[PDB]
Amino acid sequence: AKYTRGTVTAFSPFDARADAEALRKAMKGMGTDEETILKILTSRNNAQRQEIASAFKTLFGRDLVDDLKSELTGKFETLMVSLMRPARIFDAHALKHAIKGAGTNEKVLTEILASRTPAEVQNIKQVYMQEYEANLEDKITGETSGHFQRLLVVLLQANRDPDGRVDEALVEKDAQVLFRAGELKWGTDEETFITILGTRSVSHLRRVFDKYMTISGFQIEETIDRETSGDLEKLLLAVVKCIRSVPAYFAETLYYSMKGAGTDDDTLIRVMVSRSEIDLLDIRHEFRKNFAKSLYQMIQKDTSGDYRKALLLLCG
Ligand SMILES: [Ca+2]
Ligand SMILES: [Ca+2]
Ligand SMILES: [Ca+2]
């Protein structure tokens, strides 16, 4: 029932052709006017960016994204190109690159499958097939293994129980099962808790989590936590956090993408872009309350140049 707000809204008055002309002017000739590019791309929403891309190609017979890639470099390029990616294909594309090539980007698989709604997951699967002529499930199963793979496959079904009647007996039963699983460090008969966390309704699991706290004295996350956690544990954590609050999950994700030396820029960019028109405002709020600091301040200290300027404009 929760209603969320993003930080990027449709620009007005909108003129796709004028914006396309401005972007071309900013790139034509040696060098680049990065300032104009970031000001336009961060202030026009995703749908508007697609209209600008179409106008750009009609006026010049050039591809806006290809030109941005040739003109820009580093993190700034990645951010601008990610902003340009159609909202409808963003996740399919992210998942494709998370599984393509050597190794697997478990973080991306986990982040997306744990936080997307059933409707969003259904779109992802259809788009993946349409765009890449491949079955997403088969691709994921081929690049992942074990319990981690199975929980991902469960989430991929986008078939979690719908919110409905409260089942007190089941809440207690599930809480008892998870308590015992937690005491066993989530390494015994994993199938049982994968069914519970992957398929029970969001409303039911929130009740189960509260009961779990009463039984153990700890919140379920506290028993699954720790750096020395495996892929399954990280997915369990993401699922639990998203069941509670997707915005809080992303606030924490942003926090850890910047806490400590260096930056997980791929994650910072991915989250800022993907959530910009959904719940980034709520994310900002959760960030400030849960970390005693503003997202704006953390970004300002961790980034620089046009990349930073664009990120801050997105943050709003
Ligand atoms: Ca140029
Ligand atoms: Ca791979
Ligand atoms: Ca840092």
PDB file of C-alpha atoms in Angstrom, residues 9-312:
ATOM      1  CA  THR A   9      10.119  14.312 -12.872  1.00  0.00           C
ATOM      2  CA  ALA A  10       9.180  15.236 -16.434  1.00  0.00           C
ATOM      3  CA  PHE A  11      10.748  18.527 -17.525  1.00  0.00           C
ATOM      4  CA  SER A  12       8.559  21.412 -18.717  1.00  0.00           C
ATOM      5  CA  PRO A  13       8.287  22.983 -21.183  1.00  0.00           C
ATOM      6  CA  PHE A  14       9.610  19.973 -23.100  1.00  0.00           C
ATOM      7  CA  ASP A  15      10.989  20.278 -26.628  1.00  0.00           C
ATOM      8  CA  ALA A  16      12.674  17.047 -27.756  1.00  0.00           C
ATOM      9  CA  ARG A  17      14.042  18.605 -30.945  1.00  0.00           C
ATOM     10  CA  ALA A  18      15.507  21.605 -29.137  1.00  0.00           C
ATOM     11  CA  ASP A  19      17.142  19.297 -26.592  1.00  0.00           C
ATOM     12  CA  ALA A  20      18.484  17.088 -29.384  1.00  0.00           C
ATOM     13  CA  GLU A  21      19.939  20.135 -31.130  1.00  0.00           C
ATOM     14  CA  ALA A  22      21.558  21.278 -27.878  1.00  0.00           C
ATOM     15  CA  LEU A  23      23.107  17.864 -27.260  1.00  0.00           C
ATOM     16  CA  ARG A  24      24.463  17.716 -30.820  1.00  0.00           C
ATOM     17  CA  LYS A  25      25.921  21.212 -30.438  1.00  0.00           C
ATOM     18  CA  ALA A  26      27.582  20.112 -27.190  1.00  0.00           C
ATOM     19  CA  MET A  27      29.293  17.180 -28.911  1.00  0.00           C
ATOM     20  CA  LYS A  28      29.991  18.444 -32.434  1.00  0.00           C
ATOM     21  CA  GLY A  29      33.626  19.407 -33.007  1.00  0.00           C
ATOM     22  CA  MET A  30      36.731  18.627 -30.945  1.00  0.00           C
ATOM     23  CA  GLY A  31      36.107  18.164 -27.239  1.00  0.00           C
ATOM     24  CA  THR A  32      32.780  18.126 -25.433  1.00  0.00           C
ATOM     25  CA  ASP A  33      30.522  20.448 -23.453  1.00  0.00           C
ATOM     26  CA  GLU A  34      29.820  17.950 -20.662  1.00  0.00           C
ATOM     27  CA  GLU A  35      27.954  20.549 -18.594  1.00  0.00           C
ATOM     28  CA  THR A  36      25.138  20.974 -21.111  1.00  0.00           C
ATOM     29  CA  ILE A  37      24.828  17.204 -21.511  1.00  0.00           C
ATOM     30  CA  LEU A  38      24.487  16.473 -17.797  1.00  0.00           C
ATOM     31  CA  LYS A  39      22.116  19.380 -17.208  1.00  0.00           C
ATOM     32  CA  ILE A  40      19.746  18.082 -19.887  1.00  0.00           C
ATOM     33  CA  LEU A  41      19.990  14.368 -19.126  1.00  0.00           C
ATOM     34  CA  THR A  42      19.522  14.769 -15.363  1.00  0.00           C
ATOM     35  CA  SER A  43      16.551  17.158 -15.670  1.00  0.00           C
ATOM     36  CA  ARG A  44      14.547  15.297 -18.341  1.00  0.00           C
ATOM     37  CA  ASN A  45      12.981  11.985 -17.293  1.00  0.00           C
ATOM     38  CA  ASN A  46      13.554   8.601 -18.903  1.00  0.00           C
ATOM     39  CA  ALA A  47      10.628   8.826 -21.319  1.00  0.00           C
ATOM     40  CA  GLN A  48      11.764  12.301 -22.377  1.00  0.00           C
ATOM     41  CA  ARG A  49      15.312  11.028 -22.952  1.00  0.00           C
ATOM     42  CA  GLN A  50      13.921   8.446 -25.386  1.00  0.00           C
ATOM     43  CA  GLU A  51      12.039  11.190 -27.217  1.00  0.00           C
ATOM     44  CA  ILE A  52      15.257  13.226 -27.387  1.00  0.00           C
ATOM     45  CA  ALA A  53      17.104  10.203 -28.776  1.00  0.00           C
ATOM     46  CA  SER A  54      14.476   9.778 -31.501  1.00  0.00           C
ATOM     47  CA  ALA A  55      14.530  13.474 -32.408  1.00  0.00           C
ATOM     48  CA  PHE A  56      18.343  13.371 -32.465  1.00  0.00           C
ATOM     49  CA  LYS A  57      18.363  10.483 -34.940  1.00  0.00           C
ATOM     50  CA  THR A  58      15.687  12.098 -37.110  1.00  0.00           C
ATOM     51  CA  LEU A  59      17.548  15.421 -37.287  1.00  0.00           C
ATOM     52  CA  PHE A  60      21.083  14.074 -37.700  1.00  0.00           C
ATOM     53  CA  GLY A  61      20.894  10.402 -38.638  1.00  0.00           C
ATOM     54  CA  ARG A  62      23.144   9.759 -35.640  1.00  0.00           C
ATOM     55  CA  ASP A  63      22.656   7.578 -32.565  1.00  0.00           C
ATOM     56  CA  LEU A  64      22.686   9.626 -29.357  1.00  0.00           C
ATOM     57  CA  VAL A  65      23.990   6.820 -27.160  1.00  0.00           C
ATOM     58  CA  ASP A  66      26.754   5.865 -29.600  1.00  0.00           C
ATOM     59  CA  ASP A  67      27.789   9.517 -29.678  1.00  0.00           C
ATOM     60  CA  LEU A  68      27.740   9.798 -25.885  1.00  0.00           C
ATOM     61  CA  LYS A  69      29.997   6.727 -25.715  1.00  0.00           C
ATOM     62  CA  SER A  70      32.446   8.229 -28.204  1.00  0.00           C
ATOM     63  CA  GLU A  71      32.420  11.658 -26.527  1.00  0.00           C
ATOM     64  CA  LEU A  72      32.520  10.678 -22.851  1.00  0.00           C
ATOM     65  CA  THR A  73      34.764   8.543 -20.654  1.00  0.00           C
ATOM     66  CA  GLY A  74      34.932   6.993 -17.206  1.00  0.00           C
ATOM     67  CA  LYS A  75      32.190   7.122 -14.599  1.00  0.00           C
ATOM     68  CA  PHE A  76      30.538  10.138 -16.225  1.00  0.00           C
ATOM     69  CA  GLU A  77      30.081   8.144 -19.429  1.00  0.00           C
ATOM     70  CA  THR A  78      28.624   5.198 -17.532  1.00  0.00           C
ATOM     71  CA  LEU A  79      26.153   7.442 -15.710  1.00  0.00           C
ATOM     72  CA  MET A  80      24.994   9.319 -18.822  1.00  0.00           C
ATOM     73  CA  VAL A  81      24.636   6.113 -20.832  1.00  0.00           C
ATOM     74  CA  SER A  82      22.753   4.430 -17.981  1.00  0.00           C
ATOM     75  CA  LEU A  83      20.375   7.388 -17.734  1.00  0.00           C
ATOM     76  CA  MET A  84      19.719   7.017 -21.467  1.00  0.00           C
ATOM     77  CA  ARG A  85      18.864   3.312 -21.223  1.00  0.00           C
ATOM     78  CA  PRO A  86      15.095   2.790 -21.615  1.00  0.00           C
ATOM     79  CA  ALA A  87      13.465   2.070 -18.261  1.00  0.00           C
ATOM     80  CA  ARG A  88      11.765  -1.006 -19.760  1.00  0.00           C
ATOM     81  CA  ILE A  89      15.061  -2.690 -20.657  1.00  0.00           C
ATOM     82  CA  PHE A  90      17.304  -1.486 -17.823  1.00  0.00           C
ATOM     83  CA  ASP A  91      17.010  -4.591 -15.641  1.00  0.00           C
ATOM     84  CA  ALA A  92      17.120  -7.089 -18.504  1.00  0.00           C
ATOM     85  CA  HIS A  93      20.318  -5.404 -19.677  1.00  0.00           C
ATOM     86  CA  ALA A  94      21.800  -5.350 -16.175  1.00  0.00           C
ATOM     87  CA  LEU A  95      21.051  -9.045 -15.700  1.00  0.00           C
ATOM     88  CA  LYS A  96      22.510  -9.917 -19.103  1.00  0.00           C
ATOM     89  CA  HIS A  97      25.806  -8.242 -18.245  1.00  0.00           C
ATOM     90  CA  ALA A  98      25.765  -9.781 -14.772  1.00  0.00           C
ATOM     91  CA  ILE A  99      25.798 -13.252 -16.330  1.00  0.00           C
ATOM     92  CA  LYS A 100      27.703 -12.688 -19.582  1.00  0.00           C
ATOM     93  CA  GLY A 101      31.396 -13.553 -19.692  1.00  0.00           C
ATOM     94  CA  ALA A 102      33.651 -15.103 -17.054  1.00  0.00           C
ATOM     95  CA  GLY A 103      32.456 -15.067 -13.461  1.00  0.00           C
ATOM     96  CA  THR A 104      29.055 -13.881 -12.284  1.00  0.00           C
ATOM     97  CA  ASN A 105      27.926 -10.597 -10.757  1.00  0.00           C
ATOM     98  CA  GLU A 106      25.944 -12.056  -7.862  1.00  0.00           C
ATOM     99  CA  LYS A 107      25.347  -8.591  -6.425  1.00  0.00           C
ATOM    100  CA  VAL A 108      23.312  -7.479  -9.438  1.00  0.00           C
ATOM    101  CA  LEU A 109      21.296 -10.714  -9.638  1.00  0.00           C
ATOM    102  CA  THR A 110      20.533 -10.412  -5.930  1.00  0.00           C
ATOM    103  CA  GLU A 111      19.710  -6.711  -5.941  1.00  0.00           C
ATOM    104  CA  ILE A 112      17.260  -6.964  -8.819  1.00  0.00           C
ATOM    105  CA  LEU A 113      15.481 -10.218  -7.998  1.00  0.00           C
ATOM    106  CA  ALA A 114      15.073  -9.341  -4.323  1.00  0.00           C
ATOM    107  CA  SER A 115      13.732  -5.806  -4.861  1.00  0.00           C
ATOM    108  CA  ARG A 116      11.577  -5.938  -7.978  1.00  0.00           C
ATOM    109  CA  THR A 117       7.811  -6.405  -7.815  1.00  0.00           C
ATOM    110  CA  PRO A 118       6.122  -9.394  -9.469  1.00  0.00           C
ATOM    111  CA  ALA A 119       5.006  -7.104 -12.304  1.00  0.00           C
ATOM    112  CA  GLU A 120       8.544  -5.812 -12.782  1.00  0.00           C
ATOM    113  CA  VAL A 121       9.983  -9.333 -12.817  1.00  0.00           C
ATOM    114  CA  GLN A 122       7.401 -10.443 -15.388  1.00  0.00           C
ATOM    115  CA  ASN A 123       8.430  -7.520 -17.619  1.00  0.00           C
ATOM    116  CA  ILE A 124      12.099  -8.378 -17.171  1.00  0.00           C
ATOM    117  CA  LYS A 125      11.582 -11.934 -18.404  1.00  0.00           C
ATOM    118  CA  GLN A 126       9.536 -10.873 -21.426  1.00  0.00           C
ATOM    119  CA  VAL A 127      11.957  -8.106 -22.368  1.00  0.00           C
ATOM    120  CA  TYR A 128      14.976 -10.367 -21.933  1.00  0.00           C
ATOM    121  CA  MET A 129      13.486 -12.868 -24.379  1.00  0.00           C
ATOM    122  CA  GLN A 130      12.408 -10.185 -26.862  1.00  0.00           C
ATOM    123  CA  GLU A 131      15.690  -8.263 -26.778  1.00  0.00           C
ATOM    124  CA  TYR A 132      18.268 -11.025 -26.343  1.00  0.00           C
ATOM    125  CA  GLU A 133      16.439 -14.005 -27.858  1.00  0.00           C
ATOM    126  CA  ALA A 134      17.166 -16.084 -24.769  1.00  0.00           C
ATOM    127  CA  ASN A 135      15.296 -17.459 -21.772  1.00  0.00           C
ATOM    128  CA  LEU A 136      16.465 -15.562 -18.690  1.00  0.00           C
ATOM    129  CA  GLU A 137      15.821 -18.477 -16.338  1.00  0.00           C
ATOM    130  CA  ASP A 138      17.985 -20.832 -18.393  1.00  0.00           C
ATOM    131  CA  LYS A 139      20.755 -18.237 -18.469  1.00  0.00           C
ATOM    132  CA  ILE A 140      20.651 -17.712 -14.710  1.00  0.00           C
ATOM    133  CA  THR A 141      20.596 -21.445 -13.942  1.00  0.00           C
ATOM    134  CA  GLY A 142      23.585 -21.907 -16.226  1.00  0.00           C
ATOM    135  CA  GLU A 143      25.693 -19.304 -14.440  1.00  0.00           C
ATOM    136  CA  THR A 144      24.680 -19.899 -10.809  1.00  0.00           C
ATOM    137  CA  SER A 145      24.592 -22.968  -8.569  1.00  0.00           C
ATOM    138  CA  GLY A 146      23.063 -24.599  -5.509  1.00  0.00           C
ATOM    139  CA  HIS A 147      20.691 -23.005  -3.025  1.00  0.00           C
ATOM    140  CA  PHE A 148      21.603 -19.535  -4.272  1.00  0.00           C
ATOM    141  CA  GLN A 149      20.480 -20.576  -7.753  1.00  0.00           C
ATOM    142  CA  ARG A 150      17.258 -22.103  -6.456  1.00  0.00           C
ATOM    143  CA  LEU A 151      16.205 -19.039  -4.471  1.00  0.00           C
ATOM    144  CA  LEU A 152      16.921 -16.864  -7.525  1.00  0.00           C
ATOM    145  CA  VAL A 153      14.777 -19.197  -9.629  1.00  0.00           C
ATOM    146  CA  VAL A 154      11.994 -18.981  -7.046  1.00  0.00           C
ATOM    147  CA  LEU A 155      12.048 -15.188  -7.194  1.00  0.00           C
ATOM    148  CA  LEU A 156      12.180 -15.329 -10.989  1.00  0.00           C
ATOM    149  CA  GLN A 157       8.750 -16.985 -10.970  1.00  0.00           C
ATOM    150  CA  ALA A 158       7.218 -13.727  -9.678  1.00  0.00           C
ATOM    151  CA  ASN A 159       4.703 -15.965  -7.945  1.00  0.00           C
ATOM    152  CA  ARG A 160       4.955 -14.937  -4.293  1.00  0.00           C
ATOM    153  CA  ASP A 161       1.684 -15.498  -2.407  1.00  0.00           C
ATOM    154  CA  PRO A 162      -0.530 -12.412  -2.740  1.00  0.00           C
ATOM    155  CA  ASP A 163      -1.303 -10.407   0.390  1.00  0.00           C
ATOM    156  CA  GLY A 164      -4.420 -11.874   1.989  1.00  0.00           C
ATOM    157  CA  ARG A 165      -5.933 -13.241   5.200  1.00  0.00           C
ATOM    158  CA  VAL A 166      -3.774 -13.367   8.311  1.00  0.00           C
ATOM    159  CA  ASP A 167      -2.862 -16.940   9.248  1.00  0.00           C
ATOM    160  CA  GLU A 168      -1.736 -16.776  12.883  1.00  0.00           C
ATOM    161  CA  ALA A 169      -0.995 -20.504  13.097  1.00  0.00           C
ATOM    162  CA  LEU A 170       1.188 -20.317   9.990  1.00  0.00           C
ATOM    163  CA  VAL A 171       2.960 -17.184  11.213  1.00  0.00           C
ATOM    164  CA  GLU A 172       3.974 -19.025  14.375  1.00  0.00           C
ATOM    165  CA  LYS A 173       4.935 -22.186  12.478  1.00  0.00           C
ATOM    166  CA  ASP A 174       7.092 -20.291   9.965  1.00  0.00           C
ATOM    167  CA  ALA A 175       8.728 -18.223  12.704  1.00  0.00           C
ATOM    168  CA  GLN A 176       9.673 -21.395  14.574  1.00  0.00           C
ATOM    169  CA  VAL A 177      11.138 -22.899  11.395  1.00  0.00           C
ATOM    170  CA  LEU A 178      13.212 -19.797  10.657  1.00  0.00           C
ATOM    171  CA  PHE A 179      14.391 -19.553  14.272  1.00  0.00           C
ATOM    172  CA  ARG A 180      15.774 -23.079  14.135  1.00  0.00           C
ATOM    173  CA  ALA A 181      17.260 -22.467  10.685  1.00  0.00           C
ATOM    174  CA  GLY A 182      18.954 -19.351  12.028  1.00  0.00           C
ATOM    175  CA  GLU A 183      20.376 -21.228  14.999  1.00  0.00           C
ATOM    176  CA  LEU A 184      21.875 -23.633  12.468  1.00  0.00           C
ATOM    177  CA  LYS A 185      23.502 -20.677  10.697  1.00  0.00           C
ATOM    178  CA  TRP A 186      21.217 -21.117   7.683  1.00  0.00           C
ATOM    179  CA  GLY A 187      23.203 -24.124   6.501  1.00  0.00           C
ATOM    180  CA  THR A 188      20.772 -26.978   7.146  1.00  0.00           C
ATOM    181  CA  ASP A 189      17.763 -28.077   5.074  1.00  0.00           C
ATOM    182  CA  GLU A 190      17.879 -24.758   3.210  1.00  0.00           C
ATOM    183  CA  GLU A 191      14.973 -25.816   0.997  1.00  0.00           C
ATOM    184  CA  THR A 192      12.551 -25.214   3.857  1.00  0.00           C
ATOM    185  CA  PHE A 193      13.456 -21.581   4.519  1.00  0.00           C
ATOM    186  CA  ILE A 194      13.842 -20.847   0.809  1.00  0.00           C
ATOM    187  CA  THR A 195      10.168 -21.741   0.346  1.00  0.00           C
ATOM    188  CA  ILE A 196       9.150 -19.539   3.267  1.00  0.00           C
ATOM    189  CA  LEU A 197      11.203 -16.458   2.410  1.00  0.00           C
ATOM    190  CA  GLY A 198      10.702 -16.811  -1.322  1.00  0.00           C
ATOM    191  CA  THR A 199       6.976 -17.572  -1.523  1.00  0.00           C
ATOM    192  CA  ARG A 200       5.034 -16.372   1.536  1.00  0.00           C
ATOM    193  CA  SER A 201       3.269 -13.033   1.104  1.00  0.00           C
ATOM    194  CA  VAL A 202       4.975  -9.791   2.065  1.00  0.00           C
ATOM    195  CA  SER A 203       2.365  -9.089   4.743  1.00  0.00           C
ATOM    196  CA  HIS A 204       2.732 -12.610   6.145  1.00  0.00           C
ATOM    197  CA  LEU A 205       6.517 -12.436   6.287  1.00  0.00           C
ATOM    198  CA  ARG A 206       6.475  -9.083   8.070  1.00  0.00           C
ATOM    199  CA  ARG A 207       4.405 -10.782  10.783  1.00  0.00           C
ATOM    200  CA  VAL A 208       6.767 -13.766  10.766  1.00  0.00           C
ATOM    201  CA  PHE A 209       9.757 -11.456  11.203  1.00  0.00           C
ATOM    202  CA  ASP A 210       8.168  -9.798  14.237  1.00  0.00           C
ATOM    203  CA  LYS A 211       7.400 -13.196  15.751  1.00  0.00           C
ATOM    204  CA  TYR A 212      10.973 -14.286  15.017  1.00  0.00           C
ATOM    205  CA  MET A 213      12.246 -11.284  16.991  1.00  0.00           C
ATOM    206  CA  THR A 214      10.052 -12.196  19.961  1.00  0.00           C
ATOM    207  CA  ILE A 215      11.309 -15.797  19.899  1.00  0.00           C
ATOM    208  CA  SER A 216      15.056 -15.201  19.507  1.00  0.00           C
ATOM    209  CA  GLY A 217      15.515 -11.660  20.781  1.00  0.00           C
ATOM    210  CA  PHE A 218      17.258 -10.793  17.514  1.00  0.00           C
ATOM    211  CA  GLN A 219      15.917  -9.528  14.192  1.00  0.00           C
ATOM    212  CA  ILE A 220      16.347 -12.137  11.458  1.00  0.00           C
ATOM    213  CA  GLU A 221      18.962  -9.986   9.682  1.00  0.00           C
ATOM    214  CA  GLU A 222      21.212 -10.102  12.744  1.00  0.00           C
ATOM    215  CA  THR A 223      21.454 -13.883  12.458  1.00  0.00           C
ATOM    216  CA  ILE A 224      22.112 -13.904   8.708  1.00  0.00           C
ATOM    217  CA  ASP A 225      24.534 -10.958   8.700  1.00  0.00           C
ATOM    218  CA  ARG A 226      28.347 -10.863   8.713  1.00  0.00           C
ATOM    219  CA  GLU A 227      30.945 -10.173   6.024  1.00  0.00           C
ATOM    220  CA  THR A 228      31.921 -13.847   5.807  1.00  0.00           C
ATOM    221  CA  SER A 229      28.511 -14.575   4.289  1.00  0.00           C
ATOM    222  CA  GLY A 230      28.045 -16.583   1.103  1.00  0.00           C
ATOM    223  CA  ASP A 231      25.912 -15.807  -1.939  1.00  0.00           C
ATOM    224  CA  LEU A 232      22.830 -17.458  -0.437  1.00  0.00           C
ATOM    225  CA  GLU A 233      23.164 -15.472   2.784  1.00  0.00           C
ATOM    226  CA  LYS A 234      23.464 -12.179   0.914  1.00  0.00           C
ATOM    227  CA  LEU A 235      20.362 -13.026  -1.110  1.00  0.00           C
ATOM    228  CA  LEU A 236      18.466 -13.978   2.056  1.00  0.00           C
ATOM    229  CA  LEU A 237      19.446 -10.629   3.575  1.00  0.00           C
ATOM    230  CA  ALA A 238      18.337  -8.701   0.499  1.00  0.00           C
ATOM    231  CA  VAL A 239      15.016 -10.534   0.347  1.00  0.00           C
ATOM    232  CA  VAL A 240      14.314  -9.920   4.040  1.00  0.00           C
ATOM    233  CA  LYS A 241      15.257  -6.252   3.829  1.00  0.00           C
ATOM    234  CA  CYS A 242      13.095  -5.717   0.748  1.00  0.00           C
ATOM    235  CA  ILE A 243      10.128  -7.435   2.383  1.00  0.00           C
ATOM    236  CA  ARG A 244      10.424  -4.820   5.153  1.00  0.00           C
ATOM    237  CA  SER A 245      11.216  -1.765   3.032  1.00  0.00           C
ATOM    238  CA  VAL A 246      12.667  -1.588  -0.461  1.00  0.00           C
ATOM    239  CA  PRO A 247      13.668   2.053   0.100  1.00  0.00           C
ATOM    240  CA  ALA A 248      15.554   1.135   3.293  1.00  0.00           C
ATOM    241  CA  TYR A 249      17.270  -1.695   1.430  1.00  0.00           C
ATOM    242  CA  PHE A 250      18.512   0.706  -1.228  1.00  0.00           C
ATOM    243  CA  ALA A 251      19.555   3.319   1.330  1.00  0.00           C
ATOM    244  CA  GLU A 252      21.808   0.719   2.965  1.00  0.00           C
ATOM    245  CA  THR A 253      23.029  -0.422  -0.455  1.00  0.00           C
ATOM    246  CA  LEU A 254      24.034   3.162  -1.282  1.00  0.00           C
ATOM    247  CA  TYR A 255      25.681   3.570   2.114  1.00  0.00           C
ATOM    248  CA  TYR A 256      27.916   0.542   1.618  1.00  0.00           C
ATOM    249  CA  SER A 257      28.693   1.504  -1.970  1.00  0.00           C
ATOM    250  CA  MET A 258      30.499   4.532  -0.503  1.00  0.00           C
ATOM    251  CA  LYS A 259      31.542   3.605   3.050  1.00  0.00           C
ATOM    252  CA  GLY A 260      35.311   3.136   3.300  1.00  0.00           C
ATOM    253  CA  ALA A 261      38.119   3.773   0.814  1.00  0.00           C
ATOM    254  CA  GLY A 262      37.062   4.019  -2.826  1.00  0.00           C
ATOM    255  CA  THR A 263      33.579   3.644  -4.270  1.00  0.00           C
ATOM    256  CA  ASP A 264      31.521   0.842  -5.779  1.00  0.00           C
ATOM    257  CA  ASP A 265      30.614   3.235  -8.575  1.00  0.00           C
ATOM    258  CA  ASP A 266      28.811   0.571 -10.585  1.00  0.00           C
ATOM    259  CA  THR A 267      26.343   0.136  -7.732  1.00  0.00           C
ATOM    260  CA  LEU A 268      26.087   3.857  -6.959  1.00  0.00           C
ATOM    261  CA  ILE A 269      25.212   4.577 -10.600  1.00  0.00           C
ATOM    262  CA  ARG A 270      22.912   1.579 -10.977  1.00  0.00           C
ATOM    263  CA  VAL A 271      20.869   2.348  -7.876  1.00  0.00           C
ATOM    264  CA  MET A 272      20.652   6.111  -8.443  1.00  0.00           C
ATOM    265  CA  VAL A 273      19.476   5.572 -12.012  1.00  0.00           C
ATOM    266  CA  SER A 274      17.174   2.587 -11.538  1.00  0.00           C
ATOM    267  CA  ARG A 275      15.378   4.118  -8.558  1.00  0.00           C
ATOM    268  CA  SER A 276      15.390   7.745  -9.716  1.00  0.00           C
ATOM    269  CA  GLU A 277      11.745   7.635 -10.843  1.00  0.00           C
ATOM    270  CA  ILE A 278      10.369   5.210  -8.281  1.00  0.00           C
ATOM    271  CA  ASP A 279      11.520   5.719  -4.709  1.00  0.00           C
ATOM    272  CA  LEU A 280      14.804   7.644  -4.624  1.00  0.00           C
ATOM    273  CA  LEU A 281      13.178  10.341  -2.470  1.00  0.00           C
ATOM    274  CA  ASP A 282      12.100   7.716   0.065  1.00  0.00           C
ATOM    275  CA  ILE A 283      15.605   6.250  -0.171  1.00  0.00           C
ATOM    276  CA  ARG A 284      17.086   9.650   0.710  1.00  0.00           C
ATOM    277  CA  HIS A 285      14.798   9.785   3.746  1.00  0.00           C
ATOM    278  CA  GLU A 286      15.707   6.287   4.944  1.00  0.00           C
ATOM    279  CA  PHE A 287      19.389   7.069   4.398  1.00  0.00           C
ATOM    280  CA  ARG A 288      19.311  10.191   6.570  1.00  0.00           C
ATOM    281  CA  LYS A 289      17.416   8.474   9.379  1.00  0.00           C
ATOM    282  CA  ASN A 290      19.317   5.179   9.372  1.00  0.00           C
ATOM    283  CA  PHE A 291      22.851   6.509   8.902  1.00  0.00           C
ATOM    284  CA  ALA A 292      22.683   9.914  10.606  1.00  0.00           C
ATOM    285  CA  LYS A 293      23.941  11.593   7.432  1.00  0.00           C
ATOM    286  CA  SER A 294      22.558  12.823   4.121  1.00  0.00           C
ATOM    287  CA  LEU A 295      22.953  10.920   0.872  1.00  0.00           C
ATOM    288  CA  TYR A 296      23.908  14.202  -0.783  1.00  0.00           C
ATOM    289  CA  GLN A 297      26.835  14.643   1.618  1.00  0.00           C
ATOM    290  CA  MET A 298      28.109  11.085   1.196  1.00  0.00           C
ATOM    291  CA  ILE A 299      28.052  11.414  -2.590  1.00  0.00           C
ATOM    292  CA  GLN A 300      29.779  14.800  -2.511  1.00  0.00           C
ATOM    293  CA  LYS A 301      32.640  13.349  -0.456  1.00  0.00           C
ATOM    294  CA  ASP A 302      32.995  10.165  -2.522  1.00  0.00           C
ATOM    295  CA  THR A 303      32.809  11.512  -6.055  1.00  0.00           C
ATOM    296  CA  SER A 304      34.170  14.362  -8.168  1.00  0.00           C
ATOM    297  CA  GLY A 305      33.956  16.212 -11.470  1.00  0.00           C
ATOM    298  CA  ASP A 306      30.990  16.144 -13.829  1.00  0.00           C
ATOM    299  CA  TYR A 307      30.158  12.678 -12.495  1.00  0.00           C
ATOM    300  CA  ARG A 308      29.580  14.149  -9.033  1.00  0.00           C
ATOM    301  CA  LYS A 309      27.684  17.138 -10.427  1.00  0.00           C
ATOM    302  CA  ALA A 310      25.297  14.828 -12.291  1.00  0.00           C
ATOM    303  CA  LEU A 311      24.821  12.505  -9.319  1.00  0.00           C
ATOM    304  CA  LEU A 312      23.934  15.423  -7.055  1.00  0.00           C
TER     305      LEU A 312
END
